[PDB]
């Protein structure tokens, strides 16, 4: 007993806003659907909003302080401004000056709260309608790597400066520095597993999208009714991939492949990043001891010099 | 309406002769038949020839001419850059060239065979487009950039852990590679593709075996994001994002060695535009 | 000694074997399920 109209057109805190839905024409022409709204604004949704905007306010005001409260310099330098965690002289301490690490600490705490409350929102809104809870656990798998990056790897290493700064360029710098610090990240085996799964996810997404659009003349994209009886579009897709590869799938288990290929990426990445500093302080030397590095005795270096 | 069909009838219903590319060019397809489950046609023979010869040449260059049985310690490397665009059977890098040409033939044959099988089943040409994107990525990495730079020694070596050394050295020669705009666009599209795949898989799995209508997932995706895309729209977005991710990253690697030498000096113009130059004080200048 | 360290087997080779074997077995079972007899629309009437 679920009334979808009540679920989408209710008032109050446990209800929706933007009640008269909008409509965008180019989305209707390209994507096939153009209605915008209404959006649910219940509890677990106000908390995420408020904590996310608290952290964002802190970050942007600190940007302004660094620039000097000059709007033109603010606009010029916006993409290389950041707030950085307290330096290595401090350990995991919180008694750090506001312009040397306190702002990062406050903003990151609020960000943690907001992402947890968003997970709760996904879970409860999935249960409120008639569907199962598979997006919540995918978000949990994604959040494992987030909490490794921002909370647990610095905790095991012993300093807050092992975590990224809050900025457009700061994430690229963190990636570069973390790879440089612990040997070479190409010789991290769980980085190899992560890249395997990421590239497989992109390949599988492209394949599924292309083969469903190619057979869409026979309404193959209505995957809800195709899991009860399969018509000409699904039969043609199965035959195509059988005559190409020698094996095929269903309109059901292909999305199982999708879920697990996208899930394994974050788990393997989290394991690799956590092991990166705490057990193997140098990945090229480890790969040398593990017999996976090629000799290369006489390089032709004229390629790498201008 | 619907009944139990054993899938032998569905395979035998759709098998037709002669609707391929070679059947339209020559009037007949010489190899138009099926071996086991696979469809052999023209471009199905060229591809298999290329595959066999490429594997043989790769393994001969690895096991012999290097003397190693360790598969993760081979360096199948091109000629040096002092040889130019010349090929010599008596010089190192000859089995790399043979393997590269055979692999090119195999990949193009696979693409054309996909076009054939699409034509037999009266489908659209989306799968050949999506695969041709990454085939063109291989072509620009191994053909266009080496020719423009001026030597076959500008291609990457085909070793399993050693092609990652070429990636590292090329990325640090044009430092900083993170500051490449097309690199950033490609990374953004890769991350978005993985996110969209997870979202679609979750969404379809969450409604599978349930006594619910087909409008529940629209309400779910409208309560959380304010907007639900649709059923053909998500698969279109998947296709387009997947292709564009590599289409944009072709340009970054091509322009790294030809028109640009430094991706930190690329952004030197930004602070010199008249709208905001000369407005700061010491250490806030420029 | 010509042998890798124990971490070489723990972190590199066992996961690779697991990945390859899992791919083979998952492919076998998904193709087994896909090509069985269940409710389909008759190709003659549908087309």
């Amino acid at each position: 007993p679920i009334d979808l109209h009540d679920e989408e057109y209710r008032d109050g805190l446990e209800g929706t806003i933007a009640k008269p839905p909008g409509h965008v024409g180019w989305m209707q022409r390209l994507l096939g659907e153009g209605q915008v709204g209404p959006i649910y604004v219940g509890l677990w949704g106000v908390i995420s909003f408020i904590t996310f905007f608290a952290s964002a306010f802190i970050i942007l005001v600190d940007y302004g302080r660094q620039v000097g409260w000059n709007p033109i310099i603010y606009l010029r330098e916006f993409w290389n401004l950041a707030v950085y965690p307290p330096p290595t002289e401090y350990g995991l301490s919180w008694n750090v000056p506001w312009d040397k690490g306190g702002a990062w600490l406050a903003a990151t705490f609020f960000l943690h709260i907001s992402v947890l409350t968003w997970w709760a929102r996904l879970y409860t809104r999935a249960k409120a309608t008639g569907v199962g809870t598979q997006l919540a656990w995918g978000f949990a798998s994604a959040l494992s790597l987030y909490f490794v990056i921002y909370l647990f790897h610095p905790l095991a290493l012993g300093n807050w400066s092992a975590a990224p700064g809050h900025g457009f360029r700061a994430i690229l710098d963190w990636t570069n520095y973390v790879s440089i610090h612990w040997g070479n990240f190409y010789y991290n085996p769980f980085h190899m597993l992560s890249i395997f799964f990421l590239l497989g996810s992109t390949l599988l997404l492209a394949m599924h999208g292309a083969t469903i659009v190619a057979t869409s003349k026979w309404k193959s994209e209505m995957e809800f009714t195709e899991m009860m009886a399969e018509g000409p579009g699904t039969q043609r897709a199965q035959l195509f991939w059988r005559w190409v590869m020698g094996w095929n799938a269903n309109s059901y288990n292909i999305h199982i492949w999708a879920w697990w290929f996208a899930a394994f990426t974050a788990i393997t990445g989290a394991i690799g990043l956590f092991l990166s500093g705490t057990l193997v302080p140098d990945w090229y030397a480890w790969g040398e001891t593990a017999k996976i590095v090629a000799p290369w005795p006489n390089p032709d270096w004229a390629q790498y010099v201008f | 309406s619907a009944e139990v069909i054993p899938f032998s009838i569905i395979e035998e219903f759709y098998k037709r002769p002669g609707k391929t590319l070679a059947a339209r060019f020559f009037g007949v397809d010489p190899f138009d038949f099926w071996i086991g489950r696979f469809y052999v046609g023209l471009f199905g023979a060229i591809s298999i020839i290329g595959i066999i010869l490429g594997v043989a040449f790769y393994l001969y260059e690895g096991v012999v001419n290097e003397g190693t049985l360790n598969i993760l310690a081979m360096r199948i490397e091109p000629p040096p850059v002092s040889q130019g665009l010349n090929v010599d059977p008596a010089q190192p890098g000859f089995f790399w060239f043979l393997t590269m040409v055979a692999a090119t033939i195999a990949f193009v044959g696979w693409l054309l065979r996909q076009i054939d099988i699409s034509l037999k089943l009266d489908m659209g040409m989306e799968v050949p487009i999506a695969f041709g994107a990454v085939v063109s990525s291989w072509i620009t990495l191994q053909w266009l950039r080496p020719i423009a730079m001026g030597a076959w020694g500008h291609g990457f070596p085909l070793g399993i852990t050693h092609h990652l050394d070429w990636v590292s050295n090329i990325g640090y020669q044009y430092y900083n590679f993170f500051y490449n705009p097309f690199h950033a666009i490609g990374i953004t599209l890769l991350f978005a593709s993985t996110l969209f795949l997870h979202m679609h898989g979750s969404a379809v799995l969450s409604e599978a075996k349930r006594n619910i209508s087909d409008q529940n997932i629209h309400v779910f995706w409208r309560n959380i994001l304010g907007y639900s895309i649709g059923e053909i729209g998500i698969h279109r977005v998947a296709f387009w994002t997947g292709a564009a991710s590599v289409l944009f990253s072709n340009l970054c690697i091509f322009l790294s060695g030809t028109f640009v030498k430094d991706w930190n000096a690329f952004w030197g113009f930004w602070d010199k535009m008249p709208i905001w130059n000369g407005v700061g004080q010491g250490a806030l200048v420029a | 000694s010509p042998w890798p360290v124990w971490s070489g087997y723990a972190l590199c080779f066992v996961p690779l074997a697991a990945v390859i074997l899992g791919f083979i077995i998952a492919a076998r079972f998904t193709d087994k399920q896909a090509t069985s007899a269940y409710l389909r629309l008759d190709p003659a009437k549908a087309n």
Binding site: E226, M227, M228, A229, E230, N250, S251, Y252 | V4, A208, K209 | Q33, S36, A37, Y38, L39
Partner: peptide
Amino acid sequence: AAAPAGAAAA
């Protein structure tokens, strides 16, 4: 009875 999703609904 046998359904594409592995179910056997009456």
